[PDB]
Amino acid sequence: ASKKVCIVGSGNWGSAIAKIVGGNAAQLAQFDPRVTMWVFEEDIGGKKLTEIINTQHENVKYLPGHKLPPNVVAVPDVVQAAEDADILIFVVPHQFIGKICDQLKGHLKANATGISLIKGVLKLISEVIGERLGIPMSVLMGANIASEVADEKFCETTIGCKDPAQGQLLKELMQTPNFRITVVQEVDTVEICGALKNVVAVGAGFCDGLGFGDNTKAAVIRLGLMEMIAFAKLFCSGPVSSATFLESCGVADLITTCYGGRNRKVAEAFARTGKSIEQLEKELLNKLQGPETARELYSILQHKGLVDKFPLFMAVYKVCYEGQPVGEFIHCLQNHPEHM
Amino acid sequence: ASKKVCIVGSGNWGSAIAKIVGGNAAQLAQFDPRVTMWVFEEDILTEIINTQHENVKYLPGHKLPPNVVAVPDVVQAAEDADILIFVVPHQFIGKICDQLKGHLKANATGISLIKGVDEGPNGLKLISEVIGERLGIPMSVLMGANIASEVADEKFCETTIGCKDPAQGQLLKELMQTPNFRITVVQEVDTVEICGALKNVVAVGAGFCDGLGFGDNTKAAVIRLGLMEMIAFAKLFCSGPVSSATFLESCGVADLITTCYGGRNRKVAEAFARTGKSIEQLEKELLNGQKLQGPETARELYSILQHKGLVDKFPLFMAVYKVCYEGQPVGEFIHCLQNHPEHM
Ligand SMILES: [K+]
Ligand SMILES: [K+]
């Protein structure tokens, strides 16, 4: 009757979402209050993390100092966590979602649905999930970060969901006064924004490192946004409207990433220090996604014969991989298709 | 024949624009190289410009090209011109248009680079309409994320041109575009132009978030909801076609970002939030009593929206107004965004 929810994942992000989801699942009649959360079992000073969560209601390793609603139950076996769920929330690192799906495949409830909170990527992650698991997939993406959601700092997000009734249910499950949701129906468009924005952010960081000011940076961001839109239209199935890029997943996440984030910070240091991307991944990140995405874009654009339509994306690729001098990045924008 | 250009204005911005336009008028066949530039003469000026070729008071250091002629009388500057480029401080455009009324060449056209908004029967009135109705000429606008010092220094940036007529738009793009000043022409004048006034209201909100200590994700939502209110307000208020897509041009999202991350509205708003000093007091301390336009525009929006019964549909615009003028505690600003129409 009432829908059952499983949170697949339990780090910083998954715990922060459990705080929100546990609360709405209890309050709203349409959800079962018993929310499972799959927690990779760990030994915390002689005690099982799942047992700590189910007694202290605190993920003492990944979200210390925060209480989770007591109706959120930690479950160490991912199949047992998920097998009776009507709604699955995927909130694990990109690195692990493939292995997790390979364990879940075939064990899910009929008519189960999913939403992916995994930002990044070409094959969209939500497609990998939905194909392996056979469930309809939504996405949740916007200008937000786990620690701020845990701290109830005001921010927004976009939910991409094709089915209107399922979108409304996901909004009801996730929305609070400090986590505001807009539902749109263009799943692919919402999700591709999270990957492409990091390419633009590398360019924005180049711009900072070359000594340019905010008006030049605003042009880099905006042209980047124009290339995101054009690329989404040629790559995405489903309708792709420029209007979706006004949502949090688009312009807002692009702004915050281009003004603060590791893609921008590594890019500024590359343009100022001379160090390679790889060296900078070592020094500051113990793989940077922006340059790798640019590489994949180069490959797609060659196939389509459209390299010259995307000079910002391609300058990020050339500078990161083919030795183009970073100092040429702005020159690459001086004959942009948007001004033809 | 070749088109004659008059640059009506000669400030920091008008001189910067002279560099580009003088360069391009001299270079390009379709423009007469003789570009007039109207200069309000100054003891310490139009003679200094035509001799030394430098607006030593308003663009010191820079070389205006030589085919650009200062002219002290604005009618004499403008009367043979086919294209008038209005680039004076907003406070003078009224007086300039009054001197020019009835003295323009047949079929002359105009473009306004004056960012901001005027007053009129519908509350707000676009400067381009003030100009175009006073003079009876067709008007275009040029607006984007750009500032005079950087255009003169040839630092890369973009701008938007709003022009109803395609052939005229293309002419204006040729007059103004360089490798470091890139132009997109769109057909929506009012939409391009209204961004310049509304962005300063959002910037006051962005300044509140900085002075209350919120981070970049909160600020990005303030900026984005502010942009959503710009769009919805232009759709209900503006004449001429209004497209959401126009707000992704330089006049929209780019100028909004730069203004919310640097500019006097953001700076004064942050200081208001951090110190509890009034806008008026901060204007005195920081801007020689010059009036900050973001709050003033917010008051005008309030009146417009109150006459339409729509105050409740623009919570960000209205929170700026109530914080600046009705004593609403600035610390409540974010709360006013927690039941926004965009999320209903
Ligand atoms: K319930
Ligand atoms: K010429």
Side-chain angles (χ1 to χ4, degrees), chain A residues 16-122 124-136:
Chain A
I17 292 289
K19 285 184 73 175
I20 286 174
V21 167
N24 291 330
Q27 173 161 45
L28 301 171
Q30 60 265 44
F31 299 113
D32 188 314
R34 182 167 181 281
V35 175
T36 57
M37 173 172 71
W38 169 63
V39 177
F40 178 77
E41 195 64 88
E42 286 186 77
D43 171 37
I44 310 293
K47 214 202 215 231
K48 271 166 176 52
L49 184 53
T50 66
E51 278 174 17
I52 297 176
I53 292 171
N54 291 330
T55 55
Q56 290 195 44
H57 304 293
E58 175 178 346
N59 190 324
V60 296
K61 181 163 169 171
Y62 299 96
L63 197 66
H66 291 248
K67 292 303 179 189
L68 311 180
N71 55 303
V72 176
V73 181
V75 176
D77 178 283
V78 74
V79 174
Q80 298 184 356
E83 58 189 345
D84 312 326
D86 298 296
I87 295 172
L88 280 68
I89 303 171
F90 295 91
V91 57
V92 292
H94 188 15
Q95 298 86 287
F96 299 108
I97 185 64
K99 164 80 191 177
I100 292 161
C101 286
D102 285 348
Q103 309 304 139
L104 283 173
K105 167 146 223 158
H107 297 297
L108 304 179
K109 187 171 164 168
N111 298 332
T113 64
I115 180 159
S116 178
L117 284 54
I118 307 164
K119 203 184 296 182
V121 282
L122 298 165
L124 302 172
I125 294 164
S126 79
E127 279 182 30
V128 175
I129 294 165
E131 285 178 357
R132 291 193 201 178
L133 297 184
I135 62 183

Side-chain angles (χ1 to χ4, degrees), chain B residues 114-118 120-130:
Chain B
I114 309 175
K115 211 175 285 182
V117 75
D118 212 274
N122 287 316
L124 292 180
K125 186 170 189 63
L126 304 180
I127 294 161
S128 74
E129 280 175 14
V130 167

Side-chain angles (χ1 to χ4, degrees), chain B residues 24-33:
Chain B
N24 282 344
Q27 172 68 40
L28 294 168
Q30 66 268 41
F31 297 115
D32 189 305

